Amino acid sequence: MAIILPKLKYALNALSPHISEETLNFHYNKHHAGYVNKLNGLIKDTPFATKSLVEIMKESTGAIFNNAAQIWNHSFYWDSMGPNCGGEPHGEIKEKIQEDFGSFNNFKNEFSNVLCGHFGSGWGWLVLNNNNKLVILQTHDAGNPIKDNTGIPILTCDIWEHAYYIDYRNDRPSYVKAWWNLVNWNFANENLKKALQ
């Protein structure tokens, strides 16, 4: 199967109690795996069959896009988190956030507001925009900043209901608050360095 589900970099329970093992089980092994299985079915007998996931995402529309972009968004989501993470940013991203938001607390406040405010299925992003500045963006359904060409993804947070409904029911804000304990600044730093190159 041309497209393979990338492994999580940590155990299924590694984000607990912020996001439960049960959530990771459904979200990764059911939803995420499902988008991979679905895309592989869809790209058969198309020119997409031999393109990379990223190329498919950038060049498709309809169901192919929806599945391709979701696979990519989820992998970026999992990599945006980790055990032994969260807290204050550190390394290059700490200083960049200071420059572009004034403080980590300012960034945290605006990001949480955006994440809490998104109507329907979607994603909040920290991105390096096309003017070399960190900004917060939101996208709807499977959308992302690479497809939109609105900047280079640094971190993402999924706010589709399946991301939090097991653990928090309707209480998205509690999910967003808990997510701050999981934010992987090492990942952000890796993305920033590539982005600025």
Interface ranges with a second copy (CB under 8 A): 26, 30-31, 34, 63, 66, 119-121, 140-142, 160-162, 165-166, 169-170
Q: Which single residue brings its beta carbon nearest to Cl ion?
A: 185
| Secondary structure of residue 151 in the 3-state scheme | strand
| Secondary structure of residue 157 in the 3-state scheme | strand
Please state the closest distance from residue 48 (CB atom) to Cl ion, in A: 33
Which residue in 123, 131, 126, 80 sits closest to 106, CA to CA? 126
- Please tell me the total number of residues recorded for the chain in this structure: 197
User: What is the rounded distance in angstroms from the CA atom of residue 41 to the CA atom of residue 77?
Assistant: 24
Please state the closest distance from residue 152 (CB atom) to a second copy, in A: 24
Q: Which is nearer to Cl ion, 64 or 85 (CB)?
A: 85
User: What is the rounded distance in angstroms from the CA atom of residue 154 to the CA atom of residue 185?
Assistant: 9
180 binds, among Cl ion, a second copy, none (CB under 5 to 8 A by kind): none
Please tell me the number of Cα atoms within 13 Å of 34 on its side-chain side. 10
Please state the closest distance from residue 43 (CB atom) to a second copy, in A: 16
Please state the closest distance from residue 188 (CB atom) to a second copy, in A: 27
Contacts with Cl ion, residue ranges (CB under 5 A): 22, 25, 85, 185-186
